[PDB]
Design a protein around this ligand. Structure first.
Ligand SMILES: [Ca+2]
Ligand SMILES: [Ca+2]
Ligand SMILES: [Ca+2]
Ligand SMILES: [Ca+2]
Ligand SMILES: [Zn+2]
Length: 316
């Protein structure tokens, strides 16, 4: 809609208060005009019809419990946009400031979130396995990163290339979590998963095998479930990425960590410059070595650590 940019206030899924950019025109809408061609948040009204209605509010105050997932979807999409702009010089997901759209209150008791080719979509959860999924910044950044991948490398959602597609979204979801810097960790979905059980998460990057995911290529899932294990075999790449950043010894191979910022730069370059729709794990290793080489020199510690990290997870 056309109107006047302003700032409202609300409370997110976890009960925290935040300021959100809104637009005023009779109602106040969840439309942030300060970022690219805009961030837009929609109410799907417990249906599966998308996008639903642009979120309208009478008083620019968003403290109702119905409001909470909208507040967080809108706010964390802004943070994710800011991460890509400030850290990687990328304007929105397509690199030309495409408008970012999210719908919340999708369906009834829906325990997931996704990018559907055109926008983000967030379920409310069933209240015991998940609370509303937009409450996790790693989840929001994970979904938006799928749009980035789709506009760059185009990794197909199947088999090894799909596992890479998933790992990239976990990796940047985590980097965005650290960027916003409120209790960042190397776990995925911990803020919105199983409100009744503390200390757990959906997936772990530091130790994928904690939830039964492979942490070595020898343990890869070779069956047909989950599109050939795109959410399972991503553990192998997530572990490699954790080692590149933080360091450690894994299956007897020692890796000197080079830190989060270099991890991000190396993987963003691999993604946007060297990966293709059918890239496999061995091709990712090559893309990542070449990226680190480009950025830091063939005889750097950075290149050395990328090699040891992929050796440690058994990717040659
Ligand atoms: Ca209100
Ligand atoms: Ca966290
Ligand atoms: Ca996390
Ligand atoms: Ca939990
Ligand atoms: Zn994903």
């Amino acid at each position: 809609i056309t109107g006047t940019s302003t700032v409202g206030v609300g409370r997110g899924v976890l009960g925290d208060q935040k300021n959100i950019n809104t637009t005023y025109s009779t109602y106040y809408y969840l439309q942030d005009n300060t970022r690219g061609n805009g961030i837009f948040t929609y109410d799907a009204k417990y249906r599966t019809t998308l996008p639903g209605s642009l979120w309208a509010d009478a008083d620019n105050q968003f403290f109702a419990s119905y409001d909470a997932p909208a507040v967080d979807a809108h706010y964390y999409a802004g943070v994710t946009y800011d991460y890509y702009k400030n850290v990687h010089n990328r304007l929105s997901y397509d690199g030309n400031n495409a408008a970012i759209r999210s719908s919340v209150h999708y369906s009834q008791g829906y325990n997931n979130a996704f990018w559907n080719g055109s926008q983000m979509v967030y379920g409310d959860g069933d209240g015991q396995t998940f609370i509303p999924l937009s409450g996790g910044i790693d989840v929001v950044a994970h979904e938006l990163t799928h749009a980035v991948t789709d506009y760059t490398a185009g990794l197909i959602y199947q088999n090894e290339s799909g596992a890479i597609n998933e790992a990239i979204s976990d990796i940047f979801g985590t980097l965005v979590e650290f960027y916003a810097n409120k209790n960042p960790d190397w776990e995925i979905g911990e803020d919105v998963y199983t409100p009744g059980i503390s200390g757990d998460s959906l997936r772990s990057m530091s130790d994928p095998a904690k939830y039964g995911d492979p942490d070595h290529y020898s343990k890869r899932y070779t069956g047909t479930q989950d599109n050939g294990g795109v959410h399972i075999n991503s553990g192998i790449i997530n572990k490699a990425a954790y080692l590149i950043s933080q360091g450690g010894t894994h299956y007897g191979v020692s890796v000197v960590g080079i830190g989060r910022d270099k991890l991000g730069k190396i993987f963003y370059r691999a993604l946007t410059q060297y990966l293709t729709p059918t890239s496999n794990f061995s091709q990712l290793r090559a893309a990542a070595v070449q990226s680190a080489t480009d950025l830091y020199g063939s005889t750097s510690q950075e290149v050395a650590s990328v090699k040891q990290a992929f050796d440690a997870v058994g990717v040659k």
